[PDB]
Each structure stands twice: as C-alpha cells, then as structure tokens.
C-alpha cells in the first residue's frame, strides 16, 4: 500500500518532523542503526569506508532498512559476524504525507477532489545532501575490498547516485589514520568504547597527572 518512491524522491517541502504538531506518525521502517561488533575498540577496526550521496534527495526509511540488511548480510558472509561494524548515518526524521483518494468508481462519494487536500502522515524519509555520508563500515585493513563490495551492493537499494569512499580517518573517529598512532602515543587521544576522547592541553593539572601515571 506504499506509493512508489518516485513520488517522494525530491526535497520539495520544508522539513516536517514528528513533533507536537505532526501527530499520528507511523513508526519508521528502520529501528536499528548500528550492526556488527559495536563493542569493538578503536584500534580493532582501523579501516573506514563511507557511502556518500551525490544528489540532494530524500531516502525512505524502508530503503535505508533494505540497504542495511543487504550490507549486513554481505559483511557477515565475507568478514564474519564479528569482523565489522556498520553505522547508518541517516535518520528518517522528515514525515511525508498522503492525500488519500477513494480507489472506487465514484467521485460523487464525498471525494471532494482537492478541497481540504492537506494529507495524513504516510511515512518517514531522511533528507540527504550532496557529499553526505549514508552508511559507514569500519573493519580490519585487509577487508577493504569486502567493504567496497558491500557498499556497492547496498547502492542498488537507493534512488540516486552514490559514491564509495575509503576515508582517511581512523575508524569512526574524526582523526587522520597517519596521525592517530602518535596522537595516542603522546596521549592526545584516550580510547573508550568505539571512540576516542580528545584530551586538550588545558584544564586542571589533576586531569593531566591522572594521565602519565
């Protein structure tokens, strides 16, 4: 009962979040955004590969769910269930509406046509810009081709054009891979979970002397 995605491909309206004004929104198709070994430490998965949209368009929650499932299945098949971590970087926050018409052989049956045409919430989509990351996969450095293939397969679930880019950052952090090692060595970075905490050279000296100890 869902319309084709070509009817909601473009970012034509203003953002329409589920709020205290827009009520009765059905739940989004995608509820899980992180898959694989999410508890893996930062140094475990040094390689990061992003999938980046080249179009300013709307991606539906069902499309995000399908792409996530496809990428997960290929990554589990190739690199094993604990050899990767995936993060979907798009959340379907924009509600798309439908002005429902009666699909019967009658316009006299209170169809009203375009009168009071403001629609009911049909679904949720995510707005993506040119250069915005849709999915990210971090894994071992030797699984680069597997990451590229998984993202290539996931591309087929989306309307527009997407590029696969192997980032220079270390894992899901915002720091370059070449500088990551010596930054951790000189304790500008402290690992925790899947991320690193940047430790600037300002603040109380008690925080400095709990380090170097």
């Amino acid at each position: 009962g869902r319309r084709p995605a070509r009817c909601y491909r473009y970012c034509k309206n203003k953002p329409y979040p589920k709020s205290r004004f827009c009520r009765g929104v059905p739940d989004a198709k995608i509820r899980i955004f992180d898959l694989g070994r999410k508890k893996a430490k930062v140094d475990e998965f040094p390689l990061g590969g992003h999938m980046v949209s080249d179009e300013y368009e709307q991606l539906s929650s069902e499309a995000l769910e399908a792409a996530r499932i496809c990428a997960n299945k290929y990554m589990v098949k190739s690199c094993g269930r604990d050899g990767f971590h995936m993060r979907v970087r798009l959340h379907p926050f924009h509600v798309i509406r439908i002005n429902k018409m009666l699909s019967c052989a009658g316009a006299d049956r209170l169809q009203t046509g375009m009168r009071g045409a403001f629609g009911k919430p049909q679904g949720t989509v995510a707005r993506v810009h040119i250069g915005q990351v849709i999915m990210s996969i971090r894994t071992k450095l030797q699984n680069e081709e597997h990451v590229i293939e998984a993202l290539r397969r996931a591309k087929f679930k989306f309307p527009g054009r997407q590029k696969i880019h192997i980032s220079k950052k270390w894992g899901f952090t915002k720091f370059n891979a070449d500088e990551f090692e010596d930054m951790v060595a000189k304790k500008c970075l402290i690992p925790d979970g899947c991320g690193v905490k940047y430790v600037p050279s300002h603040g109380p000296l008690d925080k400095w002397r709990v380090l170097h100890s």
């Binding site: 980046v52 250069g131 990351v133 590029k163 880019h165 980032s167």
Partner: protein, 159 residues
C-alpha cells in the same frame, strides 16, 4: 487570513537579546530629549506601556513634543504609494538618540571652525567630502624577493 492583532509577528522583534533580560538600565531614563532632535524607535518588550507599533520599529523620527515619560515623534510611514508623517507617542524606553545626527552636527561645527581658521590664515581648504578617488600611481618594491608562484591545488574528496 492574517489577524489584525497589534503584536502579531513581533515574537522576536519585541523579545530581549540573549542574557539581557531584567531591570532596564537607568541611563536610558536619564537621557535628555529636546524638541527637534532625531531619535531611533526600537521598542523593547520589557516595558509594555507606550510601546510603538511594529511598523515603527527600526524607523527614525524627529521629536516634536516632550511629556513626563514619553515623547511625540514625527516619523515617516509609507502606505501604498504615499508617505505620510505619522505622529506617535512613545515612552523613552523605546527610543534612543541618532548618532547620524550627532556626527552631522559635529561635522558642521568642525567645518565652521575650519572656515574661521582658514579665513584667519589665508590658505583655502577643502570642506566638501569627496567619494573615494581612484588610487594614485605608486611603486611596489620586491625587496629582493621573488613573488611566490601560486597554482591551483589538485582535487580530492574530503568528507
């Protein structure tokens, strides 16, 4: 379909700036407004009495009448294809002096001083301010340094 309320659309216009709520500083009350001087109408929202209408916020007028707490201002308002000089009573919280007028009177006084001084000392001097002239000819020394060669950088996708 728009309402005709007196304060429709003034949600941010009459709101206070960030971290500037509370007591109105008293120099605003201590300002002196004579008849004929030029004031800017702003319209702070802490004081709800004597508030100007939203169409006069940001406008500038001339004081014609002074009362205990407010002033009477002749301010131009454009209505369709005509401009008419409205007279509004505005409490002194919502107005301030016009530095454009202040600078102009300073310039007039300084020009009169220059006229008197130059008539005393004979030599003619320029008083009409000119627009920015074209740049005159000048020499640019290299100081024995070759100017740096610039080239466009190669493209790479960053993020």
């Amino acid at each position: 379909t728009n309402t005709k309320g007196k304060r429709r659309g003034t949600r941010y216009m009459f709101s206070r700036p960030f971290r500037k709520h509370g007591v109105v500083p008293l120099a605003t009350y201590m300002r002196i407004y004579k008849k004929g001087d030029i004031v800017d109408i702003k319209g702070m929202g802490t004081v709800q009495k004597g508030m100007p209408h939203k169409c006069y916020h940001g406008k500038t007028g001339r004081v014609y009448n002074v009362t205990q707490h407010a002033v009477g201002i002749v301010v131009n308002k454009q209505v369709k294809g005509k401009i008419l000089a409205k007279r509004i009573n505005v409490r002194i919280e919502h107005i301030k002096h016009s530095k454009s007028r202040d600078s102009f009177l300073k310039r007039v006084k300084e020009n009169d001083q220059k006229k008197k001084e130059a008539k005393e000392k004979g030599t003619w001097v320029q008083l009409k301010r000119q627009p920015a002239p074209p740049r005159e000819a000048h020499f640019v020394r290299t100081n024995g340094k070759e100017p740096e060669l610039l080239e466009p950088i190669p493209y790479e996708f960053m993020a």
